[PDB]
């Protein structure tokens, strides 16, 4: 059952993102933790690249909106110095 999991905002596959896979799977006896799983490293890298791509697209299209605004304003202002005398 995984349609119910989605209508409750969970990963449909319990081996996806959740407590079961994110948390470390072991620890040394005294208590000092142990180097993470290579799956954890791989998924941290993939999520990092995803976030960076989101930043790139968002801020570049905003820069495009700003550039279009100033281009239209340049058209407006250099339309105004042709109306003297």
């Amino acid at each position: 059952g995984g349609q119910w999991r989605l209508q409750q905002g969970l990963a449909a596959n319990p081996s996806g993102y959740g407590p079961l896979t994110e948390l470390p799977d072991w620890s040394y006896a005294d208590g000092r933790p142990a180097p993470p799983m290579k799956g954890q490293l791989r998924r941290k890298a993939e999520r990092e690249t995803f976030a960076r791509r989101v930043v790139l697209l968002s801020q570049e299209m905003d820069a495009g909106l700003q550039a279009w605004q100033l281009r239209q304003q340049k058209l407006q202002e250099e339309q105004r110095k042709q109306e003297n005398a």
């Binding site: 905002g9 969970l10 449909a12 993102y17 999520r47 976030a51 930043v55 697209l57």
Partner: protein, 117 residues
């Protein structure tokens, strides 16, 4: 003969009923798309294959983000029957550099920074 398809644009004039059905917001329209492939490229023509190789959608059920520019919409409008596109809502703003290696994505379509394992 079989050809490409030209969808009439009237299929994309969302109604107010649609707005209140899905998470509608006509004005202040959403910035990005998160797109996931849910069908095979095989048994489907070659230009669909090329598009699904252009939008980064090689593996199925692997989400990839894209702009909402009409160019990418004109690409998605011919592989729409192989993709599930959901808005990437950002309840709190896009992450900063220090807290970027500690972010994660929820199945409801939201990117969130507070992901302590």
């Amino acid at each position: 003969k079989f050809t490409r398809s030209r969808i009439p644009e009237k299929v994309f004039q969302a109604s107010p009923e649609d707005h209140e059905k899905y998470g509608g917001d006509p004005q202040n329209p959403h910035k990005l798309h998160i797109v996931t492939r849910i069908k095979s490229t095989r048994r489907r023509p070659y230009w669909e294959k090329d598009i699904i190789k252009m939008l980064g959608l090689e593996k199925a059920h692997t989400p990839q983000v894209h702009k909402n520019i009409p160019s990418v919409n004109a690409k998605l409008k011919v592989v729409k029957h192989l993709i599930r596109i959901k808005p990437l809502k950002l309840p709190q703003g896009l992450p900063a550099e220090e807290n970027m290696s500690n972010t994660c994505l929820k199945s409801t379509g939201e990117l969130v920074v507070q992901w302590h394992l």
